[PDB]
Design a protein around this ligand. Structure first.
Ligand SMILES: [Fe+3]
Ligand SMILES: [Fe+3]
Ligand SMILES: [Fe+3]
Ligand SMILES: [Fe+3]
Ligand SMILES: [O-]
Ligand SMILES: [O-]
Lengths: 491, 323, 85, 491, 323, 85
């Protein structure tokens, strides 16, 4: 007979001891552990609410890969990818480049808690996390690999994060901040709580739904399988937050949350927002990016924060507001500067699309619509050259994204500048600037692409030079997703 | 325009079509793209400094660590196929020997030995798990990191067997204190202090190559010979068939960790000066291992022979790599 | 004489890098900015006049002032707004 | 370490012994074993060319069901079945009703060899066969079960073989003859050699290809998985045939082959032929049913028969010829009598379809085309009542299928009658009649539907009565698959 | 028009939504639709006669045999999940005890016992496989047939373990004649002739109910107690740990066969007269089983106690069903 | 007087069950057969005359012969062919 799990589980994580041959601070250096003056004994109250053990893990997970790899092989020959809507193909190419290697990096992040956390339960859960992101990294490489002979853009699933292309820098900027360069407790707050539980869990759910609506079952299955792994390590930051609040640290805990939610939101506004509201064909659109954010992301944070003894971040109302705006900007930026990315951006501004956009966001046409009026007239009138850029845009020094906002009849584009130690920084929002101000030694000598351009680091020092600098050539440089088909609606 | 390739750009012109293993494991770390600024943030951040010092400045050197290849070629998917198999076998053992009443048939003397020599290994095994998980996060290439990932799950695998058998033993011999007493044994038993010191000290060797050597080439060989080989042959001859089997099953994991460490060492030897570096690190740590094995095995039955056997078998591992 | 500035063009959606000269008048700054915004994402307003104000504090530069005398920090962000004076 | 299979395999099938407490004829009754005067020692030369052992089986097959059931669950919600071409839906409904329970019956057939065969290798291979058809039976029930709430026709996946509907009688007529009512050696010849190796192996391959071409991946995966099980027990009849020829029995062996190939061909001409050439949309048509038969079925039998020391059956040339004809008849029969089946038959005689039919079968329009001219004119001219029947057709007393053939400008419909013991039998071909003549005690008092009708066994004794007798009601009774959409091509 | 149903027509109005098991296993035999003409051919065919006589005319009677339900609820898919698990465990044992050199450690005396008492079981196990495969093809309902299908694969499973261990034994003790000698032992050893007779005779009981009783209720209980229970406890105490384990692993299969036979019997007892029918069949066969157990166990060590234990444990099986 | 026969109509594709009467003339047999073939799957030939021959051996029945006298076995198969005599 076998024991019930309940009966022996605690012994798996009864693994703390009082070092003798070396010191506690030597075995658990503060810069890696982040124990924060709170004692081993107090970290031992850490109690993960979803428990699992080695034999359960390897068993359940062999079952997941079996199914997912089996779905893949069964559908491989039908090559759905050759007849998918190109807004969808693009969606996949962006997902794989931005995510594959960051997922794999997340295993080191988990390895950070596995060695360095003073909570034994945290250390074991992180080991499974480590295993998990090894899975997400590997599979999210195996999948797009099916497609290398179709286009060089698929090579970017591997190559992206190895490049100085702007989106990639933005990506590393976020992840390195969140998970690669913080102490253990901080990783558990900023990554597993704020990002994974806060965003990527509901996002992956929605993305599988979308994939299925697009008739792409290989990818729907891929995403949907990854997602079932999430909560098992996503759970990790909650118990940390409790310990920090129950002891002397509501403020330290608070401040990390404020930082991780804002930084996540920003990445999410360039990577997911545009997709929902512009690449997804009109008639597949279940709900708007603002709606999605309100139903599935925002009320959930409020719940969690209330339940942990924390407050809404200072910027919350501003966040609320920016749901009407940020991502429209991010989309216009990406489409306008499309040769600078590795997928084809979908314009998504046909007449029908535009009345959808106006239902979901009243004011759209008399703000965002204007820039698009000009773009459109230009393509109708045979001036396509005025729809691609001759300069760089100003990049935020925190999120490494263009500084944009509301154009047209309610113009409101602001720059949240800061002079610090003889240098001028640029910020896309009050929050991005505040992230820097609370911890300037963390960001101080970093340089964004514009900085680099201006410093002579990009040579030749013109647009073709920045293309080379970003590893982009014809073949991968993005163009209009639907090859300008939607222009015919206007002649 | 750039042509679609047959395989990843970083793998093109290999002559042989890249394996699954090569496709999902190679050239994945990006922190090594800028040895001067690993992370996309300020270059004086403590983590920037940690990686520069402990990864980049290691004396163990190679021009292309990304060339490293697990000889077992493990990926997540095949790791869990192998380990689900080996776990059906071990959980099988547990189920069926319980059913048999195996723990009831052990003698009091042997039960006492288990409490002292077997149960407290949950600390030593958790500490290897920490050890291997650290190699993961500091090693210079993803294929190195991966070996260390799967080895860290094995280490958890062993902690888990021990945690499990520890309840069963407590359930069968409630007066002995299985499950309550192990910390004080780990902390205060002279038989454990050889290992405890070896592992506490090796746990703070931050340099990636010195961590690899201290954990994989020195501590592991010594823990394995003492706790799997010696206590297991002992277990079998004292009538503990479960632990004789359990221990041999875990030695399968250990032999795999050995195969990749040996491959790494083999690769490091392509470069002039590395043998000396590795040999030097071994000499610093071998004396702590010797002590570990002495303090543990001498307290066993037929103590001195166990010490001679464990010493020489663990040295053999290193001799075979050319060290 | 080449001097970087960041152009926040009225009714655009994005602030942008615009290299100007230190010898340029505000008028000539504004013209080098419009190049990147007018008939790209902003409709000309030929009834109107393009003016230059400093973004941080709202100071309005006379049309005829040169960059050289404006007291700008390299990369300083400038509003380019439509007026009639 | 483990042994190599090669090293111990023979011991698994070293299981023959010389009974003492009972007699050999008592343990192996001739009517079940069919040892045929050939000794235990001579049966022991039986050597299956594809070997497998218990642990390999349960392992490999857990892998197959995992994938197949996983594909099913992943695609369930997309409900492809609600937007599949109705010629395809129909194809599936016919497949499930005619096959599910016959597959499950095949396990008893395998059980026949498992107990009763004197070849030990045969007895073990049959055990795996037994396992296999348990799998084919079960899964081919689990699958259509997803679809019960869509139409009562899906209930026929279970109910069909329980009914006296004519197709079902035809089905039982074939299977019971082939596998349920013969001795072990005979089952191994007639089922695994002649039918499984001869027909159903290449057929299932083609049907998976078709399913995939239709964009039905659940079913493509289903069929394709079943098929990978086939050869492992399909192999069984070959070694039997060798033993019989090497000892005194080329004629007995010959005659069973002749019988099983003709009986299979007939069933295949009503169940597969119509599908290929008429339900499959025109532009999915990879090749004709005649072509398929020539490439994949016929040259293969020739090969096999030559390699075993056997000859081509006496009817071979006639078989060759009938490839131009039989199934067109069978299709016209099924469509015309469509309320008598449980799927909707596809007419498949649009203008485009008809010029395809004329490329593949020169003469089609000036023979088969004529009946269809009349059907068509009638539907154009608002006389749909002349396209459904007011009587039964003459049924063959061997294959239990209508007696039909070439109509129109080259009329050639023949009846191969036989008076035997004061009763008149009807036969659809020279071969069907000959099957009866060589072994009349096997078929003598059976009655086909027409017999039953004429004997007063169907009451009320009219068409509505035969509907009840066949368990058919509105809901399941078939109509035109595409609801007569193709009639518009003619007005 | 007829409405789409929630489930199969033959299952509608069950209150509880039918399980996978019910969906794929029930009401599948069609030969029972026409007890006067089972098969769609002439009604005087020998097979027509065989089924009328041995299925329909059985004295063991029920109005609705299709109501029968495996208590284990096995379908192919879950049969192979269970058995792949149990095979990873057994193949695991084989791999790892080989590695250990287990066959080398057995004493000559024990090796001699294996050749006589263990190896020749390949015949007895193949003959159960034949026995159970016959119940399959003659039983009155698919759910009965299914239990017998999966039991027939277990029987092959056991033949297969024995075939395998028989090479390993031949490989280790080439002079003994493992693999060559078993037929003459099966055929001529007095220890086997009790069983050989029991099984040869029970193999020609064609009536479905008499086959069920003779094979499942009588022969199996007796083979299981003698070859798994008795030879296995013996194996363990003589130092054969592999066979002690192997045998206990196969007894898992046997306990499952028992659970379904017991459920069948339970169902047959709903009808007046069946207990008497079953009791009568048991009395006809029990004496052959007694003889089997006597001739086999008496030649074992501590022979007489093995006979008392095997007799009473196998009777117990039947007592528990109410027989 | 009701008597079953099997009708093999010229240019049809199928032999069929056709109940006739024992008192019917060949002409009346042919008419009860056409019902199931003409304007269903066979085109009328009104220039022609429907004749009845026994299928097994090709014997031609006069138009005026009654079923009663033809010597048919119940269920016997009959050719129904187009002629001008
Ligand atoms: Fe992940
Ligand atoms: Fe994650
Ligand atoms: Fe099959
Ligand atoms: Fe088959
Ligand atoms: O994850
Ligand atoms: O099959």
């Amino acid at each position: 007979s076998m024991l019930k799990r309940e009966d022996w589980y605690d012994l798996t994580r009864t693994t703390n001891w009082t070092p003798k041959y070396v010191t506690e601070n030597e075995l658990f250096p503060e810069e890696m552990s982040g124990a924060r003056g709170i004692s081993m004994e107090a970290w031992e109250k850490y109690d993960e609410p979803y428990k699992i053990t080695y034999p359960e893990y390897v068993s359940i997970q062999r079952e997941k890969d079996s199914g997912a790899y089996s779905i893949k092989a069964a559908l491989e020959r039908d090559g759905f990818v050759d007849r998918a809507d190109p807004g969808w193909v693009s969606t996949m190419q962006l997902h794989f480049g931005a995510i594959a290697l960051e997922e794999y990096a997340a295993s080191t992040a988990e390895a950070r808690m596995a060695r360095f956390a003073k909570a034994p339960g945290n250390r074991n859960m992180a080991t499974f996390g480590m295993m998990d992101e090894n899975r997400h990294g590997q599979i999210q490489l195996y999948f797009p690999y099916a497609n290398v002979k179709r286009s060089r853009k698929w090579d970017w699933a591997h190559k992206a994060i190895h490049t100085n292309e702007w989106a990639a820098i933005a990506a590393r900027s976020f992840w390195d901040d969140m998970m690669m360069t913080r102490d253990s407790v901080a990783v558990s707050i900023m990554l597993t709580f704020a990002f994974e539980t806060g965003f990527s869990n509901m996002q992956f759910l929605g993305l599988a739904a979308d994939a299925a609506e697009a008739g792409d079952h290989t990818f729907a299955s891929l995403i949907s399988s990854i997602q079932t792994d999430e909560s098992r390590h996503a759970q990790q930051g909650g118990p940390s937050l409790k310990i920090l609040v129950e002891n002397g640290k509501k403020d330290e805990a608070q401040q990390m949350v404020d930082v991780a939610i804002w930084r996540s939101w920003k990445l999410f506004s360039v990577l997911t927002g545009p997709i929902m509201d512009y690449y997804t064909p009109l008639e597949s659109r279940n709900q708007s990016f603002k709606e999605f954010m309100l139903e599935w992301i925002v009320a959930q944070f409020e719940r969690q924060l209330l339940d942990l003894g924390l407050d809404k971040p200072w910027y919350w109302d501003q966040f609320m507001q920016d749901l009407d705006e940020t991502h429209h900007g991010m989309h216009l930026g990406v489409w306008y500067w499309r040769p600078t990315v590795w997928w084809d951006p979908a314009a998504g501004v046909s007449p029908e699309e535009r009345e959808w956009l106006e239902e979901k966001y009243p004011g759209w046409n008399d703000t965002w619509g204007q820039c698009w009026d000009v773009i459109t007239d230009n393509l109708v009138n045979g001036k396509p050259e005025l729809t691609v850029p001759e300069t760089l845009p100003t990049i935020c020094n925190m999120c490494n994204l263009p500084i944009a906002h509301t154009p047209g009849n309610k113009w409101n584009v602001k720059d949240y500048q800061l002079e610090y130690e003889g240098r001028l920084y640029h910020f896309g929002s009050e929050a991005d600037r505040w992230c820097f101000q609370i911890d300037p030694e963390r960001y101080k000598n970093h340089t964004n692409l514009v900085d680099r351009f201006l410093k002579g680091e990009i040579q030749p020092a013109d647009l073709a030079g920045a293309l080379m600098y970003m590893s982009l050539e014809p073949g991968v440089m993005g163009d209009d997703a639907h090859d300008y088909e939607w222009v015919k609606a206007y002649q | 325009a750039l042509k679609p390739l047959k395989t990843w750009s970083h793998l093109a012109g290999n002559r042989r079509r890249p394996s699954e293993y090569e496709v999902v494991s190679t050239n994945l770390h990006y922190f090594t793209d800028n040895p001067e600024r690993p992370w996309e943030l300020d270059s004086n951040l403590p983590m920037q400094t940690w990686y520069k010092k402990y990864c980049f400045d290691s004396p163990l050197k190679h021009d292309d660590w990304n060339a490293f290849r697990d000889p077992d070629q493990l990926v997540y998917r095949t790791y869990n196929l192998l380990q689900d198999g080996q776990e059906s076998y071990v959980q099988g053992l547990f189920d069926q020997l319980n059913d048999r009443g195996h723990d009831q048939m052990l003698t009091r003397e042997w039960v006492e030995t288990l409490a002292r020599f077997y149960t407290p290994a949950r600390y030593l095994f958790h500490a290897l798990q920490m050890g291997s998980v650290y190699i993961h996060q500091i090693a210079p290439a993803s294929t190195i990191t991966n070996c260390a990932t799967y080895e860290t799950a094995d280490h958890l695998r062993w902690l888990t067997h021990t945690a499990y058998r520890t309840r069963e033993l407590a359930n069968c011999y409630p007066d002995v204190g299985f499950g309550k007493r192990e910390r004080d044994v780990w902390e205060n038993d002279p038989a454990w202090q050889g290992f405890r010191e070896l592992i506490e000290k090796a746990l703070i060797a931050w340099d990636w190559g010195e961590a690899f050597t201290a954990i994989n080439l020195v501590t592991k060989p010594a823990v394995e010979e003492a706790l799997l080989q010696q206590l297991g042959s002992l277990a079998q001859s004292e009538g503990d068939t479960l632990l004789g089997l359990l221990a041999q099953a875990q030695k399968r994991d250990a032999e795999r960790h050995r195969r990749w460490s040996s491959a790494l060492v083999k690769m490091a030897l392509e470069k002039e000066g590395n043998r000396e570096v590795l040999q030097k690190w071994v000499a610093k740590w071998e004396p702590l291992a010797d002590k570990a094995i002495e303090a543990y095995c001498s307290a066993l039955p037929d103590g001195e022979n166990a010490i001679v056997e464990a010493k020489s078998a663990s040295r053999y591992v290193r001799q075979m790599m050319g060290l | 004489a080449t001097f970087p500035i960041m152009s926040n063009f009225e009714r655009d959606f994005v602030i942008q890098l615009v290299p100007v000269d230190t010898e340029d008048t505000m008028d000539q700054v504004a013209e080098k900015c419009a190049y990147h915004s007018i008939n790209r994402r902003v409709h000309p307003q030929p009834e109107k006049i393009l003016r230059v104000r400093r973004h941080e504090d709202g100071t309005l530069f006379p049309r005829g002032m040169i960059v050289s005398d404006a007291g700008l920090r390299p990369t300083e962000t400038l509003d380019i707004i439509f007026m009639d004076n």
